[PDB]
């Protein structure tokens, strides 16, 4: 199906304690493949997926240098932004950046994106056309005009439409066992009483890849988000994912409450009733 | 903007002297590099610097020293000059992280020559040779050639001047000064140019033609033992007048 | 060797297409540059390309094929002032050094409608102890070599542009210092055309 390659960068300042913490992570779909932590031993980009160690010394050499260059911009970004909002030297603040690309099931380019946040809300974003910027406030307006002047989006678009899709494709064929597999969810259902006149029905989905899954509850046709409790999709930690959904039932009526499971690795969408 | 400026254009040194080469850049670039270029080897990196205060070596750093105390200035210095440093030095600059359109822009260069003893230094002898009578007969056109010979180092600039103004519009000078004896590194050099005009331009005796060769050598400050004349940076000229034939 | 360039020298006439090639060896290269450098001066940037396909800029056209690791440069409609050496440059990032090819030297020869090869002897305006043979007005196909004894110095073939007749012409120059030498003998080391004018 669709695939993606995304990189995630967090920088957090440590006043009185030192140079900021920098963490970078690369994903293809929902498989992390590389990392860099500013606090780790090696001070290099490190592998995280089997299929990426067939890249030569050149690759790692290069990726270390680029992630250190990223680290450096973020280091400086934290100080610039502190000046932009006239904040004190004493406070710890947060920069996050995320960029990447989507391809379709022909593997041709689909979407490209580059997002930026300061203290967990949006700062500046590359718009969908990859030519222009959305700025969040007056302080980001400075950054917007600087990035217009320094031709950033030009370089970004060249990467996102080009290199980003060229390397994703390489990665996908390098990790064909790993990445091109889809694992169907192994389903399950439980039941425990809450009161005397009340029951809870819990749909379950285990061991699926990828993480995109829909679980929905419904009585008799018309679907339900009124008693519905969903948990967030959580990793099992072996590379597969898990999720559940619960509803409170006026008990005796657990005949006519049904559960819908939607996932990419399912030939048919699953209808599950409590037997 | 001025871009990348370098100083000076040409230089001679003897073995052992020190010299700094200036370099400046206008564009708030972080990333500056020093190169040299040589006839067999192409561009080789000497030192380079990816921000202010900080510098690191390249593939050919031996004998050269570098410092980057401001964003704008990146001087290369040589403390004991050696004849293997006879080369063309280029400065270059690149944005780094500051304004990422990724192109690197070079400076105009410093052409540099180091010799074992500076009694090798000679200015050129300049002569103008007048159009052959046969050429004018055959073509109705007139080629003046200029010979600049006997100079070391190969640090010359040749211009042609008719009636007091400089000409480009009929010229062909050699791209490289020729070696008079390809057997020495001490060997002096020779360069030709050509000025072609119409027969009726050349046959006017009011017309004054002049081959100027600017030479680069020693300075006024320099010590000189010889009773041949001290070969300073000087201009050497030769001239011809129109001939009524 | 990281950047591999077209060997050279590459000679085309005026009006022609000068095609330049360049292959590189680092796959993760993301920026690509053509430089012009005339003899005696500094490398000047003429073309930057960033993604697969063609960039056109006046007479220049650069193309890129990242997948076969190849950058090219076409010079459409050649002036003789396009004669230089052309440098290929490749980089991966802001902080990764620019990798340079050796250069391809490109000579643009002039369109000479009807030649007349000729060797003339010039005498001077003043007082120098050489004398000069000029070889002029000859074919763009014609070469000049330089051997003999080493008291005879021949220059290389250069081109002048008179903007009166729109007249371009080729020329080389030979001289000896203390000699006895003649002009109809000095260019015997070169393939002179059979119909070359020797004056009396």
């Amino acid at each position: 199906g669709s695939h993606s390659m995304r990189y995630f960068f967090t920088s957090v300042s440590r006043p009185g304690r030192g140079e900021p913490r920098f963490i970078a992570v690369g994903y293809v779909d929902d498989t992390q493949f590389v990392r860099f932590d500013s606090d780790a031993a090696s001070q290099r980009m490190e592998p995280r997926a089997p299929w990426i160690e067939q890249e030569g010394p050149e690759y790692w050499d290069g990726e270390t240098r680029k992630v250190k260059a990223h680290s450096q911009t973020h280091r400086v970004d934290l100080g610039t932004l502190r000046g932009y909002y006239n904040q004190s030297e004493a406070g710890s603040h947060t920069v996050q950046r995320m960029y990447g690309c989507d391809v379709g099931s022909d593997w041709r380019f689909l979407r490209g994106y580059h997002q930026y946040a300061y203290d967990g809300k949006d700062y500046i974003a590359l718009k969908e056309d990859l030519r222009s910027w959305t700025a969040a406030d007056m302080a980001a307006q400075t950054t917007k005009h600087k990035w217009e002047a320094a031709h950033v989006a030009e370089q970004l678009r060249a990467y996102l439409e080009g290199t980003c899709v060229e390397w994703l494709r390489r990665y996908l064929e390098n990790g064909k066992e790993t990445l091109q597999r889809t694992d169907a969810p192994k389903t399950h259902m439980t039941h425990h009483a809450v009161s005397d006149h009340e029951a809870t029905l819990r749909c379950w989905a285990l061991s699926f890849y990828p993480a995109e899954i829909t679980l929905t509850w419904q009585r008799d046709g018309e679907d339900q988000t009124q008693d519905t409790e969903l948990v967030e999709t959580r990793p099992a930690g072996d590379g597969t994912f898990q999720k559940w959904a619960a509803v409170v039932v006026p008990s005796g009526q657990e005949q006519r409450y049904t559960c819908h499971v939607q996932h990419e690795g399912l030939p048919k969408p699953l209808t599950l009733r409590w037997e | 903007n001025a871009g990348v400026t370098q100083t000076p254009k040409f230089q001679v040194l003897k073995t052992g002297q020190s010299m700094t080469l200036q370099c400046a850049q206008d564009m708030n670039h972080e990333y500056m590099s020093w190169y040299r270029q040589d006839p067999g080897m192409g561009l080789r990196l000497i030192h380079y610097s990816v921000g202010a205060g900080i510098t690191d070596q390249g593939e050919v750093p031996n004998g050269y020293n570098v410092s980057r105390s401001t964003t704008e200035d990146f001087p290369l210095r040589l403390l004991s000059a050696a004849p293997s440093q006879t080369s063309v030095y280029f400065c270059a600059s690149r944005p780094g992280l500051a304004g990422g359109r990724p192109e690197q822009y070079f400076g105009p260069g410093t052409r540099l020559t180091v010799t074992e003893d500076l009694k090798n230094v000679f200015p050129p002898e300049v002569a103008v040779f007048e159009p052959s009578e046969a050429e004018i007969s055959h073509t109705q056109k007139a080629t003046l050639v200029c010979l600049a010979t006997g100079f070391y180092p190969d640090h010359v600039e040749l211009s042609w001047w008719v009636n007091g103004k400089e000409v480009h519009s009929g010229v062909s000078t050699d791209p490289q000064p020729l070696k008079e004896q390809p057997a020495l590194n001490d060997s002096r050099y020779a360069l030709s140019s050509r000025l072609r005009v119409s027969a009726t331009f050349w046959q006017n005796p009011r017309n004054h033609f002049r081959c100027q060769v600017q030479f680069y050598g020693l300075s006024e400050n320099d010590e000189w033992t010889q009773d041949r004349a001290k070969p300073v940076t000087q201009i050497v000229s030769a001239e011809a007048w129109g001939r009524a034939d | 060797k990281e950047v591999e360039q077209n060997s050279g020298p590459l000679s085309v006439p005026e009006g022609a297409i000068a095609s330049l090639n360049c292959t590189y060896s680092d796959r993760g290269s993301q920026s690509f540059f053509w430089y012009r450098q005339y003899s005696g001066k500094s490398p000047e940037l003429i073309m930057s390309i960033y993604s697969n396909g063609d960039k056109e800029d006046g007479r220049f056209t650069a193309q890129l094929n990242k997948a076969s690791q190849y950058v090219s440069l076409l010079i459409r409609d050649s002036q003789p002032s396009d004669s230089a050496t052309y440098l290929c440059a490749v980089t991966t990032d802001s902080w990764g050094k620019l990798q340079f090819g050796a250069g391809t030297q490109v000579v643009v020869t002039p369109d000479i409608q009807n030649p007349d090869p000729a060797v003339y002897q010039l005498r001077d305006s003043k007082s120098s102890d050489k004398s000069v043979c000029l070889f002029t007005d000859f074919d763009s196909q014609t070469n000049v070599s330089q051997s003999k004894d080493s008291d005879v110095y021949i220059t290389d073939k250069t081109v002048l542009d008179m903007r009166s007749m729109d007249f371009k012409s080729n020329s080389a120059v030979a001289w000896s210092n203390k000699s006895d030498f003649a002009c109809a003998n000095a260019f015997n080391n070169s393939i002179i055309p059979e119909d070359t004018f020797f004056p009396s």
Partner: peptide, 9 residues
């Protein structure tokens, strides 16, 4: 493969 050209804000 990472982006080659990050610029300050």
């Amino acid at each position: 493969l990472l982006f080659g050209f990050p610029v300050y804000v």
